Design a protein around this nucleic acid. Sequence first.
RNA 1: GAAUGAUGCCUGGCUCGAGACCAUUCAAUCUCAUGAUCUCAUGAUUAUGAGAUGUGAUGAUGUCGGACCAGGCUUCAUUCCCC
Length: 1137
Amino acid sequence: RRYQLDVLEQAKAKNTIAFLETGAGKTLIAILLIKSVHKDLMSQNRKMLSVFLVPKVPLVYQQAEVIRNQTCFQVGHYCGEMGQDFWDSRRWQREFESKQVLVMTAQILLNILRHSIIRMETIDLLILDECHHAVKKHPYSLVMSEFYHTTPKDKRPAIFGMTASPVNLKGVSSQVDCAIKIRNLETKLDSTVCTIKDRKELEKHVPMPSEIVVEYDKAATMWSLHETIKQMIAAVEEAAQASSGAANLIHKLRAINYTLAELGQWCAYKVGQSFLSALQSDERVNFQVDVKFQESYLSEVVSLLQCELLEGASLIKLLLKYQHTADFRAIVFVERVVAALVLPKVFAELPSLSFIRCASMIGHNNSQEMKSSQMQDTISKFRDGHVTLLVATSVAEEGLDIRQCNVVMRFDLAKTVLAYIQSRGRARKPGSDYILMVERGNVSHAAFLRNARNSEETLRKEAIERTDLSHLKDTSRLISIDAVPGTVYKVEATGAMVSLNSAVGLVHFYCSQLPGDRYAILRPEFSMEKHEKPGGHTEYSCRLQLPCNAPFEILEGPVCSSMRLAQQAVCLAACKKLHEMGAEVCESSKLFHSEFAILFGNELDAEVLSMSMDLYVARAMITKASLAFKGSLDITENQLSSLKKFHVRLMSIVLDYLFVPVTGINWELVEKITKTLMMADGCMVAEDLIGKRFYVDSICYDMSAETSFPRKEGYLGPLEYNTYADYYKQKYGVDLNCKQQPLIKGRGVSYVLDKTYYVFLPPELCVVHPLSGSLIRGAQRLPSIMRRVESMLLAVQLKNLISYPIPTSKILEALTAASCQETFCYERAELLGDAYLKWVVSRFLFLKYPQKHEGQLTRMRQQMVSNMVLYQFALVKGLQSYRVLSSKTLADVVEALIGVYYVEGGKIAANHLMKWIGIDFVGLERALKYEFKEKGLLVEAITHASRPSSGVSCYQRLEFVGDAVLDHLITRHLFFTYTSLPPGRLTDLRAAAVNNENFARVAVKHKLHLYLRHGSSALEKQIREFVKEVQKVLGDIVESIAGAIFLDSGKDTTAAWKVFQPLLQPMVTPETLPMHPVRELQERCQQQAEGLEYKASRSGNTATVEVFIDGVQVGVAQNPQKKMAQKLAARNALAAL
RNA sequence: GAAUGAUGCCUGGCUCGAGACCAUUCAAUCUCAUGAUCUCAUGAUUAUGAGAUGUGAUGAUGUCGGACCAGGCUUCAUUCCCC
C-alpha cells in the first residue's frame, strides 16, 4: 500500500530507522529499493553491495527462499559455520562477478572488518535487524564505532536497520515519552527514525486480535503438601550442594519444581517420566562416576516423587472450544521447553488429540533436540495441514512464515510482551482473539498487564513523531543522552577493544599450533588476582601463562581496575607482541687384445684418456689402449676427402673423427675397397664376406654342389634338393657354371654349430663383398668404441670441471642413466647427494633461524628440497649439454653429481659445487650407555609439547636436526656398506632404515619412556601399550637426542655416530618387513589376486579371502584387520602347504 | 625375410596396499559471547549467535611398492632364410 511508497521516499532519501511491526514485509520494500538502486547504474556499479545481516541461520534459509524468490539480479548465500579463514578472499574475488548479495552472519563480517581489507569492501548500503540489541556489549555498536567516520567516499553513508522485531529494549518508565534510548541509538548508528505516524496506513488490512485474560489455571494444582515435599527435596539438594555436572541436575530439580507448581502433580509425573528417559540416557553414556552416582541418586529421588505423582495422575476447555473443527493454525507460547516436550504425551493420552513440538538448539553433549534441519522438517510438517492441527510450540519464535493463526496462546510468557506483539502481527486476525491464561494466584500480572498497557502507550507515544526528540534538550542530557554521548572520542579504547577481541581469537589460533599428544592442549592460560588497593583503587593482577612456542608474553600484572579490563590490557600487550612476531693432427694409434687409429684435431690427454678400456661379448673380454706418437702428423686433405667418402660409405652401405686400420698406413687397401667355367680357390675364401652379406670362414670339398641337400628330418618329406644347383634352379632359376667347386661353410654376420654348417654357398653364384673377416670383426666392433669416444670427449668437457680433485672417471658411470645400455646406474652417489642435501639444508637453515618455528622451517626445507629448484640449479649448470616432461629423474642425476663430488675430494669441494649451482639424566645417559656434558640441551630434549605446569623449550627442533643428521649418517653407512645390491634391494634397505617404529625400538633398548617427563598421562598410556608391544614419540625423542649431541659436537656427526652404530647395526640385515602380508600376497598371486572386504566390521578377523594360487587361510590376532591378517594367513598357508 | 615359445629388464595406464598431505561430512570439545530476569550491586537464572579445535569415513592429490593388461630390448631352444 501507500506507506511502503512513503518509506521508500524516506529511505531512498536518507538513512532510515523504521519501527513498524512486520512493516507489511519491510524486507520486501528493502528488496524493491535495492533493485531500484541496482537497475540504476551506480557511480561504482559494485558499491551497492547491500547485505541484510542477521545472525539467525534458519532465518538465513528463509532468506535463501526470499532472495531466490526475488532478485533476478544475481545473489548468493552461505551455509555459514564453515571453514572460511582465507576462503573469504576468493569469495570477494567471485562475488564481484557473481554475487551482488552474499549472506553472512555478523561476527564473520566483524573479522572482515579486521586487517584493513581493500576499501571497506565497497558496501555503502546495508539492511540490519536486532538493532535494539546494538549496544556496548553487542558487536554492531563496535562496528559503528569505527564506522562512525564514514569518510572514504563515505564507505558507509546510509544506514537502514530493524528494531521492530525485538522491541523489548527494557525501560518503559525510562521511555514513557516517544524518544529516550531511541535518540541514543539513532545517534549511535546515525540513521534517522521514521515512525508509523498513525494507524491509518495500518489496520486497514492488519487486524489485531483483542487480548483476553484468564484467571487461575485449568491445571488441578490441588496438591500443596508436595510443595513441602519438594522443599525437603530442596534440602536434599542443599546437601548435594554442600557436597558439591551436579548443577544441571540441580536445575532439573528446579524445573520439576516449576512443573509441579504451575501445572499440578500429574504433569510433573509425566515430567518425571521424561526424567527417567533422559536419566537412562545419562546412565548409559556418562563414563564419569561421581556423576553416575548422582544419576542413581536422581533415579531414586525421581522414582520416589514421580511414583507419588503417577497417583497424582491446564487451559483444557480453551482447547476444547477450539477442538470442534480444530484450528487451521495454532500457536502456544511457553518458556520451559521440557514441559513442551512432555505435552504431546499427555495430549495423546487423556483427550486423544495429536500434538507436535519445536525444540531449541541450545544444548550440551549430544542433547536430544531437533537440529536446525530437523526444525525445518518440523516446519515443513507444519506446512502440511495435519501437523498444523498438532500445533507449533517454541521458545526462539522468530523468523518463520506462519500466517492467519486463529488461536494465540502466550501461556505464561510475559518477559517479552513487545516480542509477543511480534507474534501478534505474525497472524492476520479473521475475527481471532488472543488469550492470556494467567493465574489468578501471584498477582504481579496486574503489573505485567499495566506494563503491556504502558508498552502500547509508548508505542502510541513514538507513533507521534518526535514526542521526546525535539522536546528535551537539556533534560535529555540529564536523562540519558549525556550518559549516551558520541563516546567515540577515546582512540586507545577502540585499539584496546580490537586488541581484546583479536588477541583472544589469536590466543585461540596459536592454541591451534600442533599439540599432537592430545587433540586440544591448553597452551595459553591465566589466573586472576584481586589486586584491590586500599582506598577504592581496585586493580587486577592478570597472570598470563604461555606455551613454549610463545617466547616473551608471560605477564603477571595488576594492569587495570576491572578483571576483564585487565584481560583487555594483557591482550594489548599480546597484540603489540604479535605486531612484532605474527603480523697436422696428433697421431694416436689403437691397440687391442693393421691396427686402428682415430683422426681428430684434438690431442688426447694421457691423464684424461683411460689407460685401457674393456669390451664384453658372449665369447670373451677385449681391452684396448691408445698412444700419441706423432704430435701433429699431417696427411693430404683431398686424399682424406676421398677416403672420408669411403668411410661414410662404410657407415652407409657397408655397415648400413675417423677410424683407420694401420699396418706404414695401408692407404692402398682403403682405396681398393673404395672402388670395391670358373674354378674355386679356398685361399681366397679362407676369410671373406660374400655379397648377396655372409661371413666366409671355410669350405667343404667333400660336399659339392652336385650333392644332395641333406634333410635328416623326413616326417613331412621336405624337398631334398638333389643338387644345390637344382636348389638354386627351383627357387631363383640359377645353375652353377662349374658345379664341382667346393661349398662354402656358411657363417652368419647377422644380429649348435651344426646349424651354421647347414648353410653352404657356391663361389661364382655369389658376388664377393670384399673384406677380411678380421677387419669385419674390427668394423662391427667400432660402434661401442665410438660410444666410448663420445664418453671420453664428454670427459674432456667435464674432467675440465670448475674444480676436481680426482679425474671424473666414475662420473662417467654417474652421467649414464640407470639401467640404460646394460651399464651401471648412479644411485649410490645419488642417495648420498640426497642425504647431504637434507643435512646441509638443515645446516644452513639453522644457520639462518635459531629463532625458527619448527614446522614453519620444515615447510621452508620442503621448499628448498623441491625438485624444481634443484632442476633450476641444473639449468644454471646445464648438464643438459652433457625434452623433460617436468617429471624426471634428472634431479637424481644431480644428486649423483653431489655424492660423487663429495667422494672425489672432501665434503667441502662438493659444497663448492653446490655453491656453484645451488646457493633420570645420568640414568637415561647410561641407558644410552654414554656420557653427557650440558644438561640444558638434555632438558630441551626431554621437554615434551605437553609438560606438567612447566615450560622452557621444545624438543621438536632437535628432533628435526637429529633426523637430518641421521639420514646423513645412515646413508653414509649404507654406502660404506659395499653390498652393492640390486637397486630395488638398495631401495628396500634404505626404506627399512626410515621407520620411526624401530627408532622407538632403540628407545626401549634404553627404555626412555620411563625417563621422559610429560604433561599427558593418556599419551603415556598410549606409549605403555606400544611398550607392551615390544618386550611413536620415543623415536622422536631419540632424534631429539641425536640433534642435541649434534649441538654438543659443534655440528659433528661422528662422535655420537660411534655411540649409536653398534646398537644400530645388528638388526638391519634380517628383512622382517612389516609389509610382508600385502606385498608378498599380491606378488605370490600375480595371475589371481582377489580380495575380501574387511571395513564392514571393526577390530577382529575376517580373512576367508578369495585368493586361489596361494590358497585360503584365516589368521587370528587382536587387530590384524589393518595389516598382518594376510601375514597370519600366509603363516597358516605355509603350515598347510 | 622372420616367427614361435620360454627368458629377464625397461615404459604406459589401470588397479590393490601402506606413508604423507588437501577438501567434504556428521557428531563432539573449547573458547567468544549476546540479549532478558532477579539481585543496590556482585552474583545468580532464562533465550540465541560466531568461529577455532574436532571424530570417523568420503573424495582427492603427492610419494612407495604390488599385481594386471598393453607394449620396446635381450638370452635359451628350434623352425626357416639370404646369395
